[PDB]
DNA sequence: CAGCTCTGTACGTGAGCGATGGACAGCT
DNA sequence: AGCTGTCCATCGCTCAGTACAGAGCTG
């Protein structure tokens, strides 16, 4: 057993803390914590989750880091972490529409506070909700990548990637997502360039 | 009719489980 | 040789959002 004696009942109670400082370039917004993230106490520990593998392959990290290194990310790589929903659940379909919209009001508050250069939505499902709830925009055909709206009252961009979770069959391997991480690396460097003029 | 929303369903990989068995050393 | 246990290789299996069709619903 992956959860070494510790019950699923006990994991559902545990929350995953945010890694948020000011002056960040990137803020990874997950859907909500998973059983292993609530257990481990770190962001994306799932041996199957592609976050860390994609982070290295994209060149956003010098070496292959893991969930334990997540707290070193702001000072070294300019990366922070949060989730659309604080509550722990086994999957993303466990969460109600009210729960998600509660989370979006909370998220835009954390985002207006910390003002990162790029608010990275690790998942499309979560930016669909956030777009409608926050910008009043329900585009019929939503795309990945840089979105046309900024976080209200900020200069924070909204960039979307398929969930790093290995649950979506549409992007089955991590190699199938490294592209959105490479573009994310390019967007950052463009801003960390346009600012230096 | 035509364009919605919403719900139900089905979809690829690879990591890690437990169960199974073969290799193999120790001892009589 | 005969018997026995451990260990490890390997197998089947499970499990970590997104896209879409089609049913109700509404102009």
Q: In a 3-state reduction of DSSP, which class is residue A135?
A: helix
Residue with tokens 């991590």: A174
Strand B proximal to A196 Cβ, under 7 A: no
Domain residue ranges in chain A:
1-197
**What whole-number distance in Å separates Cα of residue A20 and Cα of residue A116?**
9
CA-wise closest residue to A57 among A190, A184, A191: A184
Tokens 């370039």 correspond to A25
Q: What resolution in angstroms, rounded to 1 decimal?
A: 2.5
* Beta carbons within 8 Å of A5's beta carbon, 6+ residues apart: none
> Do A108 and A54 contact (CB within 8 A), yes or no?
no
The spacing between the Cα labelled CA in A141 and the C1' in B4, in angstroms, equals: 14
Per the entry, the structure determination technique was X-ray
Q: Work out if A148's Cβ lies within 7 angstroms of strand B.
A: no
What architecture (CATH level 2) is domain A1-197? 3-Layer(aba) Sandwich (3.40)
The dihedrals phi and psi of A79, each to the nearest 5 degrees, come to: -115, 130
């Amino acid at each position: 057993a992956s959860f070494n004696g510790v019950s699923e009942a006990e994991l559902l109670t545990k929350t995953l803390p945010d890694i948020l400082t000011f002056n960040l370039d990137i803020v990874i917004i997950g859907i909500n914590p998973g059983l292993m993230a609530a257990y481990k106490g770190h962001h994306y520990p799932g041996p199957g989750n592609h976050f860390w593998k994609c982070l290295f392959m994209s060149g956003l990290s010098e070496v292959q880091l893991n969930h334990m290194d997540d707290h070193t990310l702001p000072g070294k790589y300019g990366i922070g972490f949060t989730n659309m929903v604080e509550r722990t659940t086994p999957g993303s379909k466990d969460l109600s529409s009210k729960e998600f919209r509660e989370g979006g009001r909370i998220l835009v508050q954390k985002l207006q506070k910390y003002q990162p250069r790029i608010a990275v939505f690790n998942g499309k499902c979560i930016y669909e909700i956030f777009s409608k709830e926050v910008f009043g925009v329900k585009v019929k055909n939503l795309e990945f990548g840089l979105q046309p709206h900024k976080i209200p009252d900020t200069e924070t961009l909204c960039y979307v990637m398929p969930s790093s979770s290995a649950r979506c069959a549409q992007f089955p391997r991590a190699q199938d997502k490294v592209h959105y991480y490479i573009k994310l690396k390019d967007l950052r460097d463009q801003l960390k360039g346009i600012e230096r003029n």
